[PDB]
Each structure stands twice: as structure tokens, then as C-alpha cells.
Amino acid sequence: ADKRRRLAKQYLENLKSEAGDLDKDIIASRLGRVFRYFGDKLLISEAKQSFTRVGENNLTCISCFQPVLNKYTFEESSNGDKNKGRLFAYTVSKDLQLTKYDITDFSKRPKKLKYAKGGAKYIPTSKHEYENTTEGHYDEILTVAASPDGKYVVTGGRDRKLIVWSTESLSPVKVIPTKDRRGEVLSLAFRKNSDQLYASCADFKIRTYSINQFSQLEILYGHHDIVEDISALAMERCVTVGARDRTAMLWKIPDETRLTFRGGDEPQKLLRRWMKEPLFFCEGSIDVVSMVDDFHFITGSDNGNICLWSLAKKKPIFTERIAHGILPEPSFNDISGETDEELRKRQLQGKKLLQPFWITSLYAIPYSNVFISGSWSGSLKVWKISDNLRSFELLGELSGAKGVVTKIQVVESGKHGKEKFRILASIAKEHRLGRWIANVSGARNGIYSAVIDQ
């Protein structure tokens, strides 16, 4: 095989030996990276932590509208004169209720401004799967995002309808049927400072619309299993992760072209490196994702793995193992239903039946060196990336939450020099999708807030 690499190098030099610029540049005249590095200025150990519980159960997301003033309009990128540059949190509940919060003041616990709950009369009178225009949701709202131009806010989940709501009246401003039986909306994202809506949908599709004209732009296909999670940035792109297939795929929307990143490492291979030197797991299912710049992104799997990926390579550039940790181990009396303690131990069978924590959500502020992960360890873990962009490290913890983290958002505040960041996470009892979590205590369905400065 060294012969093979020899011949490959031989062909490389052969074709190099066989082998207008200013024109392209002058025409271009005739027509990004990570730029923040403030992942050290944080004061984690003295962060303010607060909690609220909401009367409904099983909240699943948040959408803080953060009004960012333009340099082409200094005053406000938000329309009205009564919103006045405040911060809003949108929370969806398996109680089928959207709730609108004001979170603009970092001293006070967040305050419910408005709400809207859908019961069951919003099921259609016909099973025709085409005409589906009942204005309210009728099942298991699961994902929400709001317009960055302060115009609308849109939810979508298991009732195969993408329903967008007015920001003021909170009326269902438009409804979009997905036109399928299997069209459950799973994830939403906006193109940053745009109106374009990206929707991960579990009939293997990624649908995209313009929201301000309510128009179904363009459709994407391509995963092995359900297209679980999505995220965008400034560029006209998206990155998405399929669940039960171990592929994270990057979509160039207009050229309609994709990049595929797999996993590929092994518990046996980590056995081998430790022989050349504990406990290893299997790369089960790629679940959570956020993209951090236009050249690297980060994905979390089910067996605890946190992976830093560069668009240059295909394999992960930095894998991280069981990071949220190993689960509560099964108790002997309930494993057996038989008296003898040593037999109970023999049924517990040592190291094998252990389980890792999942990676239930993961979010990074763009263009920074920091990202936040959350499992049901009841402990947000905040991580900072080395400036060579080949590794990160555990910056620290926030244990002010408890239970199953579900959705993680940030809000920046203050001027360029001094900045104060609030971390807002929804925590439910269960997972977003099913039940799958057996009797953890101490958790209340609601919102956890943290505020750090500098």
C-alpha cells in the first residue's frame, strides 16, 4: 500500500508537471471568519442564576427577538415606536400553547406578556391532507422561531402545519400546510437579517420559504433518516444533521448542492490507542448542531460526543467523548426482583449496562469562541475554543438549571467594550419528541436564566 501512496504522489507530480486573473479582479472591482475572542472575559463562577416554572408542561423552545440596529438605519430595525428595542422570548408547549415573554431587563425574572393555546377544534373537518387551513395548531407544537425584522413569529410541529403569528396581535397571521402525511416540522431557522425561512421536516426534506410574502421558495432532499436539526448564518446556506444515519450535511441553497460529513471513529480504535498508551461508546445518532462561522461547525451526538468540524476536512477535526457524563446506574433490587445481593450484582453485569448522558441541546453565539451544551445532568457546560481552531476546552459550568435541557438561546447586552450575556434555556421533563426518560426528579418544566457580565 506504500506502493499505492508512492504512485499517488507520482501522479500528483506528473499532473503538476503537465500543468485573466487581473481581468477577474477588475470585473470584481466593477461589481466571515471568527472575529470575536471574548471567551475569556466571562465571569462564570459568579453568574446570576434564576428559575421560573410555567403552568403548562413540556416547553420546548424560546425565540428572543434581539433588535440589532443597522448601520443604514441607526434608530431601530424594529418597526413600531412602542416596542422600543426590548427583548422577547417565545416558548412552545406540548400543552399546545405559545407564550410571549418580555426579558428585556436582566434584573427581573422574565414576565409573561401574552399567550395563545390551541385546543382540539383546529383539527380539520376533512381528512383530505390537502386543504389543512385551520388557523390554530391542533397537535404537539415542537419548534419555534421569530422574524429578525420584528415582523412575525412562526411555530411548527407534529400537526404538519407551519403557523405564523403576528408579533403584536398574536393572531395566526398565516398557515402553511406541508402537503404530506409525514410532514412533521422539526426545526426552524431564519436567514440572518432576512425573511427566508428554513424548515427541517421529517419526510427527509428541507423546505424554504419567504415569510414576508408567504411563499414556498425551494425544497431540498437527501438524508438517510429524518432531518433532525438545522441552523443558518449570514450566508445563504444551511447546515443540517440527520438523526439515525450519522451524517451532517451542508446545503448551498441556490446552487442546490451539498457536502456530506460522516463520523468514522471507533470504540475499538480508542481501545487501540489506549493499548498504545478506560470505557468507550458507540457513535449512535447525530442530533444537535450549531454552526459557528462560515468554516467550522459543531455537532452533538447521542453517546455524548461533541464534534468540531471544519469544512476543509470531512472527518471530524475534534471529537469529544462522554462530556455530559455517565447516567445513573441501574439499582440492583429493581434489576432482579430476587433477594440475593451477589446474584443482583451478577445480574448488573459490571461495566456493560452503563449509559451516557445525551447531548440534548447545543448553541453558540456566532463568530465567537464559546458554545453551551446541555443534557439532563442539570448542568449547562460552557466551552471555549482555542484560537487556532483545532480544539476547545471546558470553560466552566452553570448548574443553575436542573432536568432535561431542551433549547438554548443567548442575549447580548451593553456596548462594544463591556458586554453582558444572558443564557436562556427551556427545560421540560421529557425529551422534545417522546418520553424516553425514566424518573429523574427535581425538575420543573419552565425556564432557566443565567446572566454573566464582561
Task: Give the dihedral sign, CA 219/223/227/232.
Answer: negative
Contact 166, 173 (CB under 8 A): yes
Regarding 315 and contact with another protein (CB under 8 A), the answer is: yes
Minimum CB distance to another protein smaller for 337 or for 442: 337
Regarding 4 and contact with another protein (CB under 8 A), the answer is: yes
Minimum CB distance to another protein smaller for 186 or for 382: 186
Question: How many Å apart are CA 364 and CA 239, to the nearest integer?
Answer: 14
CB 152 to another protein: min, Å:
17
Regarding 436 and contact with another protein (CB under 8 A), the answer is: yes
Residues 46-85 that bind another protein (CB under 8 A): none
Residues 374-413 that bind another protein (CB under 8 A): none
Minimum CB distance to another protein smaller for 73 or for 107: 73
CB 233 to another protein: min, Å:
18
H/E element holding 18? helix 2-18
Angular region, 351: left φ>0, alpha ψ -120 to 50, beta rest: alpha
CB 338 to another protein: min, Å:
8
Contacting range for another protein; rule: CB under 8 A; set: 43-51, 82-90, 178-186, 391-399: 178-186
Question: How many Å apart are CA 189 and CA 227, to the nearest integer?
Answer: 13
Minimum CB distance to another protein smaller for 30 or for 33: 30
Residues 181-220 that bind another protein (CB under 8 A): 181, 203-204, 209-210, 213-220
Total chain residues near another protein (CB under 8 A)? 79
Cα-Cα-Cα-Cα torsion 161, 167, 168, 171, nearest 10 degrees, comes to: 0
Q: How does DSSP assign 337-385, residue by residue?
A: -SS-HHHHHHHHTTTTT--B----EEE--TTSSEEEEE-SSS-EEEEEE
Contacting range for another protein; rule: CB under 8 A; set: 25-33, 70-78, 148-156, 288-296: 25-33
Regarding 330 and contact with another protein (CB under 8 A), the answer is: yes
H/E element holding 242? strand 237-242
Question: How many Å apart are CA 452 and CA 15, to the nearest integer?
Answer: 56
Written as nine digits, the cell of 286 is 447525530
Length of the chain: 454
For 179, phi and psi rounded to 5 degrees?
60, 60
CB within 8 Å of 274: residues ≥ 6 apart? none
Residues 265-304 that bind another protein (CB under 8 A): 266-268, 280-285, 302
Strands (E), 109-171: 111-117, 141-146, 152-157, 161-166
Q: How does DSSP assign 382-415, residue by residue?
A: EEEE-TTSS-EEEEEEE-S--SEEEEEEEEEES-
CB 67 to another protein: min, Å:
26
Minimum CB distance to another protein smaller for 329 or for 387: 329
| Per-residue contact string for residues 90-109; x = within reach of another protein by CB under 8 A | --------------------
Regarding 235 and contact with another protein (CB under 8 A), the answer is: no
Contacting range for another protein; rule: CB under 8 A; set: 63-71, 100-108, 341-349, 368-376: 341-349
Minimum CB distance to another protein smaller for 170 or for 250: 250
Residue keyed to cell 438523526: 243
CB 298 to another protein: min, Å:
16
List 193, 259, 274, 387, residue binding another protein (CB under 8 A): 259
Minimum CB distance to another protein smaller for 192 or for 314: 314
List 43, 69, 353, 394, residue binding another protein (CB under 8 A): 353
List 256, 340, 341, 387, residue binding another protein (CB under 8 A): 256
The sheet with strand 404-413 has its strands ordered as 48-53, 446-453, 420-428, 404-413
